[PDB]
Amino acid sequence: AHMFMAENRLQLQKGSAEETIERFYNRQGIETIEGFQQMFVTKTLNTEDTDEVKILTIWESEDSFNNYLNSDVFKEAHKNVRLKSDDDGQQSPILSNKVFKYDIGYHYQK
Amino acid sequence: AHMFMAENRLQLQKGSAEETIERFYNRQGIETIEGFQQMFVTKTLNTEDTDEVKILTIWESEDSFNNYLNSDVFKEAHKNVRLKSDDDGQQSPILSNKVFKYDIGYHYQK
Numbered sequence: 001a002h003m004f005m006a007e008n009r010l011q012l013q014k015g016s017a018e019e020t021i022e023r024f025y026n027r028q029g030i031e032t033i034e035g036f037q038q039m040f041v042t043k044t045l046n047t048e049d050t051d052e053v054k055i056l057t058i059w060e061s062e063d064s065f066n067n068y069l070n071s072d073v074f075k076e077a078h079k080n081v082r083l084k085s086d087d088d089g090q091q092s093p094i095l096s097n098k099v100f101k102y103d104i105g106y107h108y109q110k
Numbered sequence: 111a112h113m114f115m116a117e118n119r120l121q122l123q124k125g126s127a128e129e130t131i132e133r134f135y136n137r138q139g140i141e142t143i144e145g146f147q148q149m150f151v152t153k154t155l156n157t158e159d160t161d162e163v164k165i166l167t168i169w170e171s172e173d174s175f176n177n178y179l180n181s182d183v184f185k186e187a188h189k190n191v192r193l194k195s196d197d198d199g200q201q202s203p204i205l206s207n208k209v210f211k212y213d214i215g216y217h218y219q220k
């Protein structure tokens with residue numbers, strides 16, 4: 001069986017990557033989720049316009065990811081997450097989100 | 111303190127992702143490399159007319175990643191690696207490589 005990777009690509013206001021990444025330090029139940037293995041939250045280097053932050057989540061299977069989306073901890077962790085376009089989202093530096101999905105065909109950890 | 115991530119984004123001829131990823135299976139010295147932490151080789155799930163395979167390498171720092179690039183171990187591991195666009199790259203289904211670089215602002219491994 002192959003592991004699965006999801007990417008949430010977050011287009012952000014210039015300069016907001018650090019404050020946005022700081023929000024992930026506070027664990028909100030991901031550590032209790034079946035099939036979850038690891039996550040990286042990255043800032044793209046050398047960006048000239050908007051900041052770019054990606055949430056990369058690594059799963060035992062695509063099904064594990066699918067179920068996470070329907071979970072109470074997912075809902076709770078995102079209850080104060082807004083896009084700038086949301087009616088109550090003006091103060092948010094998060095401009096858009098885009099999801100990408102991957103099959104992990106090879107992994108190696110030293 | 112922050113880890114570093116490099117992404118090699120490879121555009122491939124349709125259908126060649128699987129045979130490309132299989133080329134990674136047997137190690138060629140990466141386990142010996144200072145500051146190397148882990149890697150993922152992914153196929154993108156999408157409806158594009160080309161395949162996409164990514165090499166994600168995770169490093170203790172950007173400097174460790176650059177040292178690897180300069181190394182004999184890198185050179186040896188890539189001796190038969192060609193782009194379709196190379197003089198002698200006729201058999202390669204790898205159409206192009208593009209490098210992206212990231213700060214890892216947060217990581218959690220279960």
Ligand code: HEM
Nearest residue numbers: 008023024026027028029030055057077081082083094097
């Ligand atoms: C595929 C759907 C998504 C997945 C798999 C995902 C994954 C995650 C994970 C694993 C965490 C850590 C949660 C925890 O500590 O329990 C998190 C938190 C967070 N996510 Fe997502 N996410 C998704 C959708 C989104 C979207 C659309 C946004 C932006 C609009 C977003 C922005 C954030 C932010 C800012 C945090 C930090 C915690 C907070 O602000 O309260 N996520 N997400």
Ligand code: HEM
Nearest residue numbers: 116118133134136137138139140167187191192193204207
């Ligand atoms: C930023 C530059 C690059 C880095 C950091 C990198 C990293 C790696 C690593 C860690 C491995 C596994 C090596 C081992 O097992 O010891 C590998 C192998 C491999 N890489 Fe790269 N690589 C880079 C450039 C490229 C490019 C430009 C291509 C394609 C044109 C490529 C294609 C491959 C392939 C097909 C393998 C499997 C081994 C083989 O075919 O002999 N790499 N690379």
